[PDB]
Design a protein around this nucleic acid. Sequence first.
RNA 1: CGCCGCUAGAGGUGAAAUUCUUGGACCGGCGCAAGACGGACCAGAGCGAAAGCAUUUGCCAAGAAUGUUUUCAUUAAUCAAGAACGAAAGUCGGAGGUUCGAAGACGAUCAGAUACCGUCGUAGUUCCGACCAUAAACGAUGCCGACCGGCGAUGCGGCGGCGUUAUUCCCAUGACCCGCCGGGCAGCUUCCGGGAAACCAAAGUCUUUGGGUUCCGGGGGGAGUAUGGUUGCAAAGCUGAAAC
Lengths: 25, 103, 52, 80, 91, 97, 136, 212
Amino acid sequence: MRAKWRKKRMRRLKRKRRKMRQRSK
Amino acid sequence: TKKSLESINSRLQLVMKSGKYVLGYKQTLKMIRQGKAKLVILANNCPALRKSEIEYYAMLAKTGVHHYSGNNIELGTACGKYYRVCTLAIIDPGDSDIIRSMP
Amino acid sequence: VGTMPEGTIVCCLEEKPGDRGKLARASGNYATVISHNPETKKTRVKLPSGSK
Amino acid sequence: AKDLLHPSPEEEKRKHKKKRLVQSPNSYFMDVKCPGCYKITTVFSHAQTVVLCVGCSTVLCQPTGGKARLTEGCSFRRKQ
Amino acid sequence: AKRTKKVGIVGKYGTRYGASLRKMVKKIEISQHAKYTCSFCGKTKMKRRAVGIWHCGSCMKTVAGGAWTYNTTSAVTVKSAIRRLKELKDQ
Amino acid sequence: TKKRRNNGRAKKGRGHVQPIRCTNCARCVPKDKAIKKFVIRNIVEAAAVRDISEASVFDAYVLPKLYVKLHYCVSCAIHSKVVRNRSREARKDRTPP
Amino acid sequence: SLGPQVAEGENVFGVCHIFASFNDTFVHVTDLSGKETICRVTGGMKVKADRDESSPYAAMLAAQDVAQRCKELGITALHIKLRATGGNRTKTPGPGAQSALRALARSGMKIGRIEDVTPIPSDSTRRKGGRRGRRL
Amino acid sequence: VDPFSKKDWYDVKAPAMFNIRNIGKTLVTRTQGTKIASDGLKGRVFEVSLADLQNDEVAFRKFKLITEDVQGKNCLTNFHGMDLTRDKMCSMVKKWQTMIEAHVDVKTTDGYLLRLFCVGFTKKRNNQIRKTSYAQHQQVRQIRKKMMEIMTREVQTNDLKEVVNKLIPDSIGKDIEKACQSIYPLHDVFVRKVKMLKKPKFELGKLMELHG
RNA sequence: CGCCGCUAGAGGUGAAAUUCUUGGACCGGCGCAAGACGGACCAGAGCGAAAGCAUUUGCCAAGAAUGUUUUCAUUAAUCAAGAACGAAAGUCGGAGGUUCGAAGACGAUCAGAUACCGUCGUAGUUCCGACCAUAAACGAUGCCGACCGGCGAUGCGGCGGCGUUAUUCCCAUGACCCGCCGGGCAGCUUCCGGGAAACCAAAGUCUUUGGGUUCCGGGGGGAGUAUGGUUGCAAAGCUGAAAC
Ligand SMILES: [Mg+2]
Ligand SMILES: [Mg+2]
Ligand SMILES: [Mg+2]
Ligand SMILES: [Mg+2]
Ligand SMILES: [Mg+2]
Ligand SMILES: [Mg+2]
Ligand SMILES: [Mg+2]
Ligand SMILES: [Mg+2]
Ligand SMILES: [Mg+2]
Ligand SMILES: [Mg+2]
Ligand SMILES: [Mg+2]
Ligand SMILES: [Mg+2]
Ligand SMILES: [Mg+2]
Ligand SMILES: [Mg+2]
Ligand SMILES: [Zn+2]
Ligand SMILES: [Zn+2]
C-alpha cells in the first residue's frame, strides 16, 4: 500500500471520527 | 509627455521653496488684474466656467496659460500642500524655468 | 443604429422605428449591435437574454 | 610560482579596474578642440551628460553606456 | 476599542438571517454606505441616494451610478469600449 | 542515486516548461524531456517514385517533401525502438551518426 | 459522355483528395473547384472485412475502381492533395497513401503536382487521451 | 438516372496578365427551373499554383481565385487569395534561425481592403563559427515596423493589377531584402499569404477593364 | 450551424460492439458563430524571490548586470515572534460552456472489472472577484563571505583589434571574425581534496577538528495517529504525545 492511499484512509477515518464527535458533542 | 510631467513636478518642487506664488481663484484674480502674475496653472477638473474665465483673463493680460493634466487633489500634491487647489500663479519664479520651457 | 459600428453596446431601443423605446430597458442591461446590411436596412442585435 | 610583487604590464593592462594592485581606474580626461569657434574644452571620458560648449551651442558628446562618442572630427589627448 | 472581530457592519442584524448571507451582504453594504470621492469637485462627499442615484454635497452635481457602488466594472468596460469604437475610424 | 546528472531532461535555468503531448499514447511531457525527432520524407515510396516518374505530366521538376516534427515520450519510445539503452560510460555520448 | 475537350495532347485536370487514416482510407476525385464530386470510393466499400480498411490492399482496389470511373467520365490528369487527421491526431499520413499514389499512377491517370494539405492547427486544443493518455 | 449524363461543362478563364488564361474546366448540374446554372459558379473558387499561369515563375506561391460570373459558356474569375504550399512553408524553418512574423490590414486605391502577411528568417553569414545567429529582439521590433511600413506604400497607393504585378516577382520581398541590409541580414523574405476580407462591388465594368 | 455536389457506409479497436447513417452520415466547396489555445521558430537560451512566464501592438510603473575620478559614510549579514507572494486540485458569488473529462452510464476484454480499450456525458478546465497555503514546491544540496586547476562555449553589458561585409560618400551604430574584463545559466577533463560509495570545483579548504548565522534529526513501528489549543465556510492546515 502506498503512503498516498495510507494517508487517504487515515484522512477518511479522521473525518468519520470527527462526525462521530460532532454527533455526540 | 512623461518627461514633460516630470519636468512640471520637479520645477514645481523648486518653485515651492524658492519662488513666490499665490493660491486660490479669488486671490489669483487680484494678481491677474494687477499683472503681477506671469503664468497660471489650472487643474483638469476645475469647472468649465472658471476655466474659461481665467483663460480669458490671461488672453487679455498677456499671461502664460497651462493646463495641469490632473485632478485638483494631485495638484495639491504638486504644489506640496495637503489641501486641494485648482489654480497656481507663479508670480515670481525664483530659480525654475517652467515659463522658459513651453512658452 | 445605422450610424454606429458593429460591436456597439446600447440600451433602450425601438423595435419598430418610432415607438419611443421598448427593448432592453431594465436595470443593468444592454443590447449589442452586429452585422449591418447596407441595402434593405436591417441589423442584428443580441438581446440581454440571448435572442439574436 | 608567479611574481605577484612585480607582475607583467601586459597582465596589468588586461586585468579589471579593481583586481590589480594599485587599483587605478581606466577612465581619462580628454581635451576636445571644438570645431566651431576655437575653444579647448576639458571633458571626462565616460561622460554621462550631454556636453554643450557654452559659446557655439553645438552638441559635443552623445553620452553612451561605456564611453561617449564624439560629434565630428574632434581630437583628444591624455594628460595626468 | 475593537468591539467586534468579524461581523463588522453586519452586527446590526444579530444572530439571525444566516452566516453566508451576512458574509455576502457585508461586502456591498460597506460599498453603499461608504463616502466616495467626487470626480467633479474633488471632495470626498459622495453619498448614495435611492438606488442608482449618487449625490455630492458640494456643487449639487447628481450622477447616475451603480446600484451599490459608484461604478460597475462592466460599465467601465463599456465606456472604454465606447471610446475605442468611437475613435475607431470615425464610425 | 542519481542515474543521470541532468535528471534526464535539459531544464536548468527554468522553473517550469510547457508540456507537449506525445504522438502515440498522448501523454503530456515537458518539451525538453521528450524524445524529439524530425522526419524528412519523400512523400512517395522511394521505390514508387519511378511509377509516377513514368506517367508524370511535367518534366520531373515537382518533388514534394513531407516534414514532420515528430514527438515521442520516453515510456513508449523505448517500446517503439528509438532510444535503446546503453552503458555507464556510454551514457556520456552525443549525436549518433 | 463526350465530356470535356478533344484535340488530344491537352489534359483535363481534376483534384484528387486522398485521406489516409489509421483505420480508413479515402480516395476522392473532384473538379478544380471542389464542389462537384466526380467519383468517390472508400476502402471499406471495396473490402468486406472491417480491419482491412486501413490495409494497403484496400487503397489499391479503391484506386482501380476510381481510375476506372474517371476514364469513364473522361478526365485525364490529376493534381493530388494528400492529408490525414491533423487536428490533435497523428500528423503523419496513414499507410494507404503509399498504395493510392502507386495504384493511381499505374493505370492511366497522369499526375500533375502533389501537395500535402494536412490541416495543421496553430495551437492544439486538448488531446483525446487525457493526462497519462493511452495505456497498452 | 446517371446524373453525369446531365452535368454541363464550362471552361474556366483566368483573369489578365498571368501569361495564358486557361485554368481548366468544371461541371455543374443544369439550369432547371428554380436552379439557375450560374448560381454555384458565383460561389466556386480555385486553388492553382504557378508555372502554368505565370509561365515559369516559382513553382510554389499558390493563388486562390473567385469565379466572378459566367460569360457565354466561359466562366471568368477575379483574384481572391494567395497562399504558399505546405511543403515550401514547412521547409526553410531551420532549428537555429529566428522566424519573424508580420501582418497588416491595408486598403487599395479602389474599394478593396485586404490583409497581407510576412515571414522572415535570419541568415548564417559566411565565415561564421557561432552557430546560433539570433537577434536581440529590438531589431525584430524595428523590422516589424519596417515590413509593415513598406507594404503600406506598395499596397495603399496602388490598385489590384499593380499589386498582383508586384506579387509576380515578389518585388515586395526583394525590396524588403534590400532595405533590410542595414539592420540585419534577413533571408528568404516572402509575404506568405494575402487574403480578402471585404469586396466592394460586383463591377463587371471593372472586370472588362481588367481584360481590355 | 447554414447552404451546394456525390454516395453507402462512417466511426472506433488486439479483434469488435455501443453511436451517426436514403429523414443523405463521413466526404469535399463556400461562409458564419462561439470559446479555449498560441505549435513549428524553442536550445542543456533568457528573465523572475520562488510558484511561473511564448501571436503583434500601445500604455503603466518596476528590476538585474555593465560603465562611472557620482553621492552618503557604516547605514552590514543571518534571523524566534510577526508579515507579502505561493502551481494543480478544492470552496463561495457572477458571466458562458469549444475541447477534454472525476463521478455516472453503457459496449467489449476477463473466471470476476466497478480497471486499463472504445461511445456518451456531469462538476471542473476560462475570465472576473474573495478563500484555502499545500507538492518529488527537487539541484531530494539553507543564506552571506573568502580561497583553492585548466579548457572550449553560450547569453548580456563594457573595452581593444588600417580582418570581412553590407548604405551614398566620410561618419557612426548595423552583421560576422579575433581577443580581454565583470558577474549568470551550464558542460568536458583531472589523483585539488573529499566521501561509505554513487559522485562533487563543491558535497573541498575537518581528529591538523572553530569565518558569521537560522531551521532542524537522534533505531524502526505505533504516527504526522490520538489529545488539547489555533486558523478555515468546508475540505483540512499549524503545533503534537504515550501505552504497547
Ligand atoms: Mg533505481
Ligand atoms: Mg518544478
Ligand atoms: Mg492488458
Ligand atoms: Mg464538412
Ligand atoms: Mg489556480
Ligand atoms: Mg465537492
Ligand atoms: Mg450558497
Ligand atoms: Mg446564486
Ligand atoms: Mg468525451
Ligand atoms: Mg512540507
Ligand atoms: Mg534557509
Ligand atoms: Mg529552504
Ligand atoms: Mg558582445
Ligand atoms: Mg545599438
Ligand atoms: Zn461635488
Ligand atoms: Zn506515447
